[PDB]
Amino acid sequence: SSTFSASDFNSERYSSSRPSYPSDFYKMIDEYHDGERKLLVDVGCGPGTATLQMAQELKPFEQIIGSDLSATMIKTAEVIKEGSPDTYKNVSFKISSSDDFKFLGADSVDKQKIDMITAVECAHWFDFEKFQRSAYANLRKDGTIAIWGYADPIFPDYPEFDDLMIEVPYGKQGLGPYWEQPGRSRLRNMLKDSHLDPELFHDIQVSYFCAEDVRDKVKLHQHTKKPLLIRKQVTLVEFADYVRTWSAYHQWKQDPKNKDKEDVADWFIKESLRRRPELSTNTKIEVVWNTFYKLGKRV
Numbered sequence: 001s002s003t004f005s006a007s008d009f010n011s012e013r014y015s016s017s018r019p020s021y022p023s024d025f026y027k028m029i030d031e032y033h034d035g036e037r038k039l040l041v042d043v044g045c046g047p048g049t050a051t052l053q054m055a056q057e058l059k060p061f062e063q064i065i066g067s068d069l070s071a072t073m074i075k076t077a078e079v080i081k082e083g084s085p086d087t088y089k090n091v092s093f094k095i096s097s098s099d100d101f102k103f104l105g106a107d108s109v110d111k112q113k114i115d116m117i118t119a120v121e122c123a124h125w126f127d128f129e130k131f132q133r134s135a136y137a138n139l140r141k142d143g144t145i146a147i148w149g150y151a152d153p154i155f156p157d158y159p160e161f162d163d164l165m166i167e168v169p170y171g172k173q174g175l176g177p178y179w180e181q182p183g184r185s186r187l188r189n190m191l192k193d194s195h196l197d198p199e200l201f202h203d204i205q206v207s208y209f210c211a212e213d214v215r216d217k218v219k220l221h222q223h224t225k226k227p228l229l230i231r232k233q234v235t236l237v238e239f240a241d242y243v244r245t246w247s248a249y250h251q252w253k254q255d256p257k258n259k260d261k262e263d264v265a266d267w268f269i270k271e272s273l274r275r276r277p278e279l280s281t282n283t284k285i286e287v288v289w290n291t292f293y294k295l296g297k298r299v
């Protein structure tokens, strides 16, 4: 979304308040990946969310590059890199579209060089077909493509908040109209309508996980497929700070037509307290997201 390129998009709050990804998932990715480790490119990298994690959580790469359209996001990524130089000595950031690999050099762009391409919490914004064709043109043989993301969390132990987990994001009088489409609908549906092309990728692996399954011992026991479990301990304040990082929230908050309305993130806190009056706003509780991933090896 162009929202994340706004000069005043709060990329610092994105970095502080957005979820990152668990070691078990990275271990799975490394078990999937075969072969050399010269170059990892993380497209749509944001403020280095997955990029900086991968420097530590995967086996070493000679170089890791995060690319993104947003200068705002890349600047934050660079700030974090510079804070731990190093830990991140082999990580660089580039302003580039997810299908533009010109930063590889005139002699390497579109010449099937990269070992692994990741696209994390962003591929719903892409023309998926155009993106996968570019990835194919930019991966070495049997190079990995790994796409993953998340949406629509619940609090497993607080089913009283399930209605808020609909109304906060999707209230018809609130944030609902502000989600950009079709990206939001694609994300919510776990990119189920977009497929790695079997002419371009093989050993294709797909997973889907509904966070409500955490409430059901049978469903957890019977998963066929190593789900991505994005579980976090958050206070109500921290969850509200995550709301404040949403693209839809940025747009809602800045729309002059909403100037006299109660802030939606603040409303979340107030309404949660009304539903669970024993809960303090600094008590940690578990939140879990719906997730997906798609893995392929370049043919």
Ligand SMILES: Nc1ncnc2c1ncn2[C@@H]1O[C@H](CSCC[C@H](N)C(=O)O)[C@@H](O)[C@H]1O
Pocket: 001, 004, 005, 018, 043, 044, 045, 046, 047, 049, 050, 067, 068, 069, 070, 073, 096, 097, 098, 099, 119, 120, 121, 122, 125, 126
């Ligand atoms: N076509 C495109 N090419 C590259 N980046 C894109 C893009 N469309 C959207 N983006 C970027 O997608 C990012 C989504 S938010 C950052 C997601 C981050 N990878 C994470 O794991 O949380 C934004 O920074 C936005 O600028």
Ligand SMILES: COC(=O)C/C(=C\C(=O)O)C(=O)O
Pocket: 121, 122, 150, 151, 152, 187, 245, 246, 247, 248
């Ligand atoms: C980078 O985040 C997303 O693309 C999805 C999203 C929010 C979310 O589902 O947490 C948004 O702000 O657009």
